[PDB]
Amino acid sequence: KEVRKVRIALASPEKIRSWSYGEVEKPETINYRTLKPERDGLFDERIFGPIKDYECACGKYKRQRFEGKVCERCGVEVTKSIVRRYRMGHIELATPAAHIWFVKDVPSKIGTLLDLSATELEQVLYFSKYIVLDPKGAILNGVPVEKRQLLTDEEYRELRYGKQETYPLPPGVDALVKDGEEVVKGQELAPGVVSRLDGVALYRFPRRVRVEYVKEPKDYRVQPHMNVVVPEGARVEAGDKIVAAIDPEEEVIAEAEGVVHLHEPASILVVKARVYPFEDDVEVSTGDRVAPGDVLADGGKVKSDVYGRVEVDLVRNVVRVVESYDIDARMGAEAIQQLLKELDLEALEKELLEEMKHPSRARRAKARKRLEVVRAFLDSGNRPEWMILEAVPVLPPDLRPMVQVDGGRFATSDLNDLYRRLINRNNRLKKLLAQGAPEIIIRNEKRMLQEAVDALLDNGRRGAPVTNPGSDRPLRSLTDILSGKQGRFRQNLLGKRVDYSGRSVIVVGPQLKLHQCGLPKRMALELFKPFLLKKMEEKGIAPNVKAARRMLERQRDIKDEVWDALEEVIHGKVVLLNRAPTLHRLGIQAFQPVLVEGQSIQLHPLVCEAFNADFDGDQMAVHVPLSSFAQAEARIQMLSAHNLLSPASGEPLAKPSRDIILGLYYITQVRKEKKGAGLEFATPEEALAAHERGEVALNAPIKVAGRETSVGRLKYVFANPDEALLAVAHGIVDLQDVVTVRYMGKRLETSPGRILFARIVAEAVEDEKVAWELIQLDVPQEKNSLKDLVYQAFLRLGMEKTARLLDALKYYGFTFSTTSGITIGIDDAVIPEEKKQYLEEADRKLLQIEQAYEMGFLTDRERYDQILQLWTETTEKVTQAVFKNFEENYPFNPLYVMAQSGARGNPQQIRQLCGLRGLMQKPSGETFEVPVRSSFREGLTVLEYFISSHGARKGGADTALRTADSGYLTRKLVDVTHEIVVREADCGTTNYISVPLFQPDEVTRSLRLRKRADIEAGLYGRVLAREVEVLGVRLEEGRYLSMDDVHLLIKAAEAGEIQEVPVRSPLTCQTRYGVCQKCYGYDLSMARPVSIGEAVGIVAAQSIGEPGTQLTMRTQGLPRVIELFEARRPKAKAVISEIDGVVRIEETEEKLSVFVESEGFSKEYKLPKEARLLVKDGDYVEAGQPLTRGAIDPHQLLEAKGPEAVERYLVEEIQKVYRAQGVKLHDKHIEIVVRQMMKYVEVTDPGDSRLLEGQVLEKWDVEALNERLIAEGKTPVAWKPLLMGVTKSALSTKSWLSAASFQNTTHVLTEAAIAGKKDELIGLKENVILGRLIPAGTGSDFVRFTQVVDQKTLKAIE
C-alpha cells in the first residue's frame, strides 16, 4: 500500500533479535591477504548477504536460477547484493547495558520512572554504588537495610563479608593475647598495638613454637616457607609432625610427648565471628552461608546462632561463622533492569494521581512530570525495561563500508571501530566470567562494556570522547550521524545534490526578454544529454543512442548537426536559475534558455534585484525539470515573467533599475534657464523679439501679458508628437526644452522628452487611452513614479502587457542613458561656498565653548555633549548646502541626478564626497571630539583615515555576525510555520481584528493618523469582516480591499468618519493546520485572492527573514525582532498595571511608589529611582497599560490583558523594526507566525477528563475535547492561554519527523520513541523527508485530482 504514517517506538530484545540475520561474534572485518570478509565478523556474508549478485562465498552457485537458496557449503544466501544495505546483525551482550539516550537526556526517563536522581543513576550504572534488591534482614549500623537503598563499596563489603582487621606486630615481640581469645574495641593486643573492634583474635604466622616435653621447654624456629600444622595447646605424641616444610630435612617433629605452644605471631587478625568447637564431621564447608538454627556439626549438637559466612578451620578443629548477611545488592544496568521489570505502571499511576491532589505546587509539578512519562509508557504499549539493551543491533555493512580506493588503500567508517571495541570487550567479559575472575576484575570489565555501548550510541555525551589511536579526532557515533548541520537530516534529507544541474559565471544580457536567459551551448549539451541522444538517434546523426553517446565523448568528434538537434531539444522547455543564498522564493526563477556562444550565463537586468545579483563575479546554478509536470509548474508558476510583484509587500519587484531609471529620468526632466527670468512684455511678438536679441533664454520663465510662460511654449507649437520629434532630429529643439504640443486633442505644454515617454508607454501596452491614464506626465520619472506605473499596468492589463511594458522601459532607458552623457569627474563633486563659512562658525562656537569650560560654567560631560551637537548641526547644514547648490546651479549634475532619480546614492554618501566626512566613533563606542572636516574630493589625512577605519571595521564585523543570526532566525520561522497552507475557501468564523487607523501619540497626547504605508501594510488585500459605509460608498462584507479601497478608507479617516477597519486575519482563522482563503486575502504576488493550496507559511517565513540582513545590529534592530519572536523577557522591561484604576504617585526622597487606586483595590508598584514614568497623577490607566518607558514583557501582558492584546503588541512591535529600516512587509506574514506562537494552552482544571493540571496541549485539541465533553453532559476542561517562542513552539509540534530534523534530535526522538508517537505527515518537512508529494501547490488535495478530457471522448464515455 501507500505510506501514510510513520511510527517510532522502543525495540525489545526480542524484536532486535528478529531483525538480525545472525549474531556478530568476532571483531574481524576482512582478511588482510585475500581481502575477503571474515566469518562471524562485521562484514560476514552468511549474515548480511552476498557481496555480488547471486553468488555465494564458496562460488558454487553463480546464477539467478538458484534464487532464495542457501549454499550448504558456505551458508551464504544466493540473492541480490543490495540486501547488504538492509540486513542487520546483532551482538548478544554478556550483561545488560543501558541506552544512553534514556539516561543522560535530562530529565532521564529511567530516573523518572525509578525515582532516582541523576547522580544516583550514574553511581549505580557505572558501578560506583550498590542498590539493594533484597535486604535479607540486613542491619546497617543498627538500622535495618531497606529496598532501593544505595550502599557504597565499604558498606556493602561490611554487610556481605563482615568486619575484620589485621594488625602487624613488630618483629621479636610476643603478643599478650592468645590464639582464639575474644577481644574488645580499644583493647591492647601486643605491647605496641591496640585493636579497633571486638572479635576473635587469631595468630596469623607464629614465628616460634615452644613445645613442652615431659621428662623441657624446647623451642623451634618457624620460617616463612614453613607452616604450623597443629593448634595451640595440643598434646603431641612422639612422632607426630609439628611444623611442615618444603624440604623434609628442615621439617620439625616431636621427640616425645608434650604440649605445643604458639608464640611470636607475625600479625593478629581480629574478626567479628562466632567460634563453634566440634568433634565429629561438619555438615557445612567453607564459603557456605548459615542462619540461626541451622545445623553445623556433630549431627545437630552444634548449631549456628547468628547469620554469617561459615569457614572450617581444620588446624583448630573449630567452625567460625563470620557475622554477615546474604544481602542482595547489585550495580550496573542489571540492577536497573530488574527494578524496571518489577514496576507496576498501573499502581504507580494511581499513587501519582493521589499525590496530584497535594496542595503544594512543587509536589504537583513533580508528580505530573513522573505521571507524563508513566502515561506515555502505558499508552504506547512499550515496556520500561526495554530501555536497557540486552542485544545491540548492528548496522548493515554497506552503510558503514570498508571500501578500497583507486590507489589500493582501504577507507572505513568510524562505526566499525566502535563496533569492534564493543565486541572485544563483550568477548573478554565472557572469558573472565567463565574463569571465575574476582569481582573487581568483573566490575571493571562490565563498566568498560557499558562505556563501549555509550560511545557507539552517542560518543562524547558522557566522559572523554573516544578517539582513534594516533589522532585526537572523536569517532563519529550513531547520534552524531543523525544530528547537527552535517547530520543525515539537514545534509541528505532536507537537501540533496541533484543530477541535470550546472553552474557558471553570470553576465548581463540586455537583449534578452524578461522570460529568457542565455545558456551556454556546452552547458546545454551536458544538461540535456539524454534528450539530445534521443534526438540524434531520431535524425541520421547517429544509428543508436550508444553510438550517439560515443560521439559526444570526444570534443573533436562532435559534428555541426548536433547543435541543430540541441536547438530542437530545448524548444519550449525552461530551466531554473538559482543564486545562493536563496533568501526568498524569487531566488529561484524559470527562464526559457537561449543557446549562446561562450561559457557565462546571460541574466536579464530586470531580475537582478530579486536574485540580489551583481556582475562582479557572481555564479548561478542551472536546473532542468524533466517531466511534463515539472515543466508545467516551472512554465506557469515559476516563470520570471509571471512573478512581477513581491510576495512580501505586493509592490513591483521587477521594475526599472539603476541605468534604466537614469536614462528615463534624463529625458523626462525639463530645462530651467536664468537669462531672462522675470521680464514682462505686452505681446508675444515682443517676447520672441527679445529672444532673437539674446535678452531672454528659451526656457526662462517670463510673463507675456499676465500669464507666466516661456519663449519655447510660444515659439514652438507642434501639431502632433511626430512633428515635435522630427524637430528634435533636426536639432531645432532638445528633449529637455519645454514647448507646446497638441496630443490627444489637448494643447499640452511639455517637453518632447515627456511626450516621447508617453508614446513609449502607449506603444508597449498598445492602447493610447489607457496608457495616458497610467502615466504622470508633468514630472520627471524617478524610481517611485516608475514603480507606480508598473503596478497600475499590472492591475489594468495583466502579466503579459506589463512584461512587455517592462521590456520597453528597459530598452529605452538603456538607449537614452548611453547617449545622454552621464559621466563622473572630480569637478562633479561640487564643494559649496557655504562649507568654508560653516566651518569658521563651528570653530568660533567651539572656541567659545572652550572659554566657557575654562571659566568653569560647565562640566566635562556637558562640554562633550555640546561639542557633539555642534558638529552634528554643522554636518546637517553642510548636507543642505551641498544639495541646495545642486538644485540651484547644477540641476543636471551626475551625483545629483543619480540621487534624485533613485538610480544610485543617498544624501549621506553625497555629503561625504562633496561636504565633510563628519564625526567618527572610537572602537569603544565614543565619538572623537575632532571630526573629519575633509571630504573624499579633498582627500583625508593619514590620521583622519585611521580614525575612519574604526567605523569601517565595526560595520564589516557587524555585517558578518548578522548574517548568521538572520539566517538562523529564518530557519526557526520556517520550522514553526512550514505546515500552514491555504486549505479551504472559508472557515465560517465570525471573529475578526480591528486594524486601527489612528495612533495614540504621547508627545502631543492625542490621536494622530498613521502613515499611509503603515495602513497599507495592514489593510491591503484583506477581506472585510463587516460592512463599512464611508463617504457614501458601501464596502460590503466579504470584499477584498484593493489599494483604491485602502486609499478611500484613509480619506474617510481624514474626514473623521472611521477609526478602525474590521478585517479577517490569520489570527482569527478557525481552519485547522492552516488558514482559509477569506482569512488570508490576496496572493500579494498577483493582486488577487489567494489560491487554495498555497504554502503561505513558507512565504511568511521567507518574507520576514529576507530583509533581516538590512536590519541594524550595531533592544533595537535584528536583536529586537529575535527577542520578540522568541517571546523573551527584556532586561529593561517596562512596568504595566495589572488592574485598571487611577494612578497615585508617592515620589519621595527615599523611594518612589506608584499606586493604582480603584473603588476597593490599591496596587503598589515600587519603581526604581531612575524610572522614566510616562504616567502622571490624575490619569485613568487600564489593565496592561504601561507605567514606565521600556519594552513590555509579552508574558506579563498576556496574563494581564489577554491573547488579543499580546497578539496586537507582538505584530506592532515587530513591524516597528522593519518600518524604521524602510522595509515594507505585510502584517499577514507576521500574524501567521504569531498565530503559531499562541497555538498552545495549559490545563488549569481537568474537569471530567484524563488531562493533568498544568499539562500543555494545543488549543484546537482542548476545544474539540471540550465540545465533546459537553455533548455527553460532562464537566468541561478549564484551560489558560499560553505564549511561547518560535523555537519552543516548533519543538513541541505533533510530528516527530519535522521536530527531529530541526533541533534537539536526541531529545525529540527519545520522547517520541517512548510515547510511540505516530507521524501523520501533515506539513511540508515530513513529506520532503520521505520524498513524497508535499500537500501544497499542485500536490494539494483541492486540485490534485482534477481530470481533463475533450468533448469527443466525453461523449464516447457517455
Binding site: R65, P224, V282, E283, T286, D288, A411, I440, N544
Partner: protein
C-alpha cells in the same frame, strides 16, 4: 567520571601481600588443586565439573550449568565420609586463596601495563588483558621453587598484553607471526636510518633482515602493514568536507549502464525473432537467457529428447543465420 581513577582507587583497597602471606596463599591454591584432583578420582566425576562447583559455592549466589545441578553435586560431595570431606574443605580454602592472590596483585599489572600505552589499545584495555595473564600466572605458579610471585607473573602479564595488541590493534586483523615480521622490519629500518643518516631503501632493509629477504618482500610487507584511513577525516580548515564525499560508489550500475543493458536485451530479442521457434530456444538455453545459467548439449538434449551432436549443429546453423542478419542490417555492432 574517570574510569582509570575509579579502577586505581578500587585496587588500592586490597593491601599488598607480604612474603609469608604470599606463600600461604600460593600453598593453599596448590593444595586445593590436588584436593580437587583426589575428589574427582574418588567420586569419578569430571575434574573440571567439580572445580566449577567448588568455585560456584565460593563466589556465592551473586554470580549468574544451572544452580540445581550445582546444589546436587554439592550435596553429593558433602555426603562423603569425614576423610573425603577433608579434601572438599581443602578445595574450598584453595579456591578462596586463589581469589585473594589474584586480587592482591592488581597493582602489579597496572605497573606493567602503563608501559604499553600508545600501541593501539587504551590503558584500561591493556589492564584487563594483563589481568587475564595474571589469572594464568596464578594457575601455573609453583611456590616450591622459592621464587617470588612477581618474578613469574611478569612473564604472563607481558605475554597477555603483547598478544592482545597483536590481535586487537588493527581494524584489519594481521596474524601474530606477520605482526612480529612487521615489528622486526620496522626496527631494522630504524637502525639503518640512524646509521646511514637517511631513510634506507628496500635493498638495504632486505639485506639487513637476512636470508630469504629481498626488496620485493619488503615492499609487500610494508604494503600489508598499511592501516585503513577513516571515511570521516576532515579536509581543510572548514569542517564541512570529508573523505567519504570524494569516493564514488562503483558497485551499483549507473543509469547509463542500466539503460544499455536493457537496450541490448531489447535488440537481441528482436534479432532472435527471425530465428525459428526451436532454434531461438536452443540459443537462449545454451547462453543462459532463460534460466540465467548456461545449459549444456546434453541437458538441453534431455529437454527436447535429442542427442548432443544435433544441438551443436543447429546452434551453429542458427548462429550463422544471426551473423547473416546482423551483416545485412548492422543494428547490433554498437553494443559490442
Amino acid at each position: 567520571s574517570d574510569p582509570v581513577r575509579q579502577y586505581l582507587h578500587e585496587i588500592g583497597q586490597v593491601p599488598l601481600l607480604t612474603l609469608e602471606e604470599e606463600v600461604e596463599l600460593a600453598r593453599k591454591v596448590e593444595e586445593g588443586m590436588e584436593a580437587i584432583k583426589k575428589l574427582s578420582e574418588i567420586t569419578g566425576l569430571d575434574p573440571d565439573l567439580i572445580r566449577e562447583v567448588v568455585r560456584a559455592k565460593i563466589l556465592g549466589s551473586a554470580r549468574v550449568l544451572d544452580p540445581k545441578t550445582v546444589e546436587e553435586i554439592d550435596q553429593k560431595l558433602k555426603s562423603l565420609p569425614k576423610e573425603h570431606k577433608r579434601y572438599l574443605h581443602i578445595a574450598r580454602e584453595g579456591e578462596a586463596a586463589r581469589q585473594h592472590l589474584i586480587e592482591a596483585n592488581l597493582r602489579l599489572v597496572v605497573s606493567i601495563a602503563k608501559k604499553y600505552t600508545g600501541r593501539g589499545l587504551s590503558f584500561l584495555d591493556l589492564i584487563q588483558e594483563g589481568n587475564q595473564g595474571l589469572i594464568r600466572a596464578v594457575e601455573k605458579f609453583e611456590y616450591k621453587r622459592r621464587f617470588k610471585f612477581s618474578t613469574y607473573a611478569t612473564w604472563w602479564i607481558r605475554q597477555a598484553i603483547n598478544r592482545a595488541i597483536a590481535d586487537q590493534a588493527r581494524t584489519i586483523r594481521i596474524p601474530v607471526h606477520m605482526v612480529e615480521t612487521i615489528n622486526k622490519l620496522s626496527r631494522t629500518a630504524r637502525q639503518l636510518q640512524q646509521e646511514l643518516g637517511r631513510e634506507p631503501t628496500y635493498e638495504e632493509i632486505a639485506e639487513a633482515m637476512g636470508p630469504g629477504w629481498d626488496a620485493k618482500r619488503v615492499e609487500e610487507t610494508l604494503k600489508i602493514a598499511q592501516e585503513p584511513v577513516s571515511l570521516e577525516t576532515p579536509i581543510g580548515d572548514e569542517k564541512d568536507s570529508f573523505y567519504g564525499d570524494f569516493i564514488p560508489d562503483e558497485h551499483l550500475p549507473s543509469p547509463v549502464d542500466a539503460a544499455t543493458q536493457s537496450l541490448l536485451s531489447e535488440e537481441l530479442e528482436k534479432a532472435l525473432s527471425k530465428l525459428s521457434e526451436r532454434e531461438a530456444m536452443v540459443l537462449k538455453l545454451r547462453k543462459g537467457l532463460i534460466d540465467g545459467r548456461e545449459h549444456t548439449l546434453e541437458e538441453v538434449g534431455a529437454f527436447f529428447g535429442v542427442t548432443r551432436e544435433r544441438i551443436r549443429q543447429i546452434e551453429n546453423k542458427a548462429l550463422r543465420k544471426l551473423k547473416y542478419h546482423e551483416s545485412r542490417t548492422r543494428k547490433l555492432r554498437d553494443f559490442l
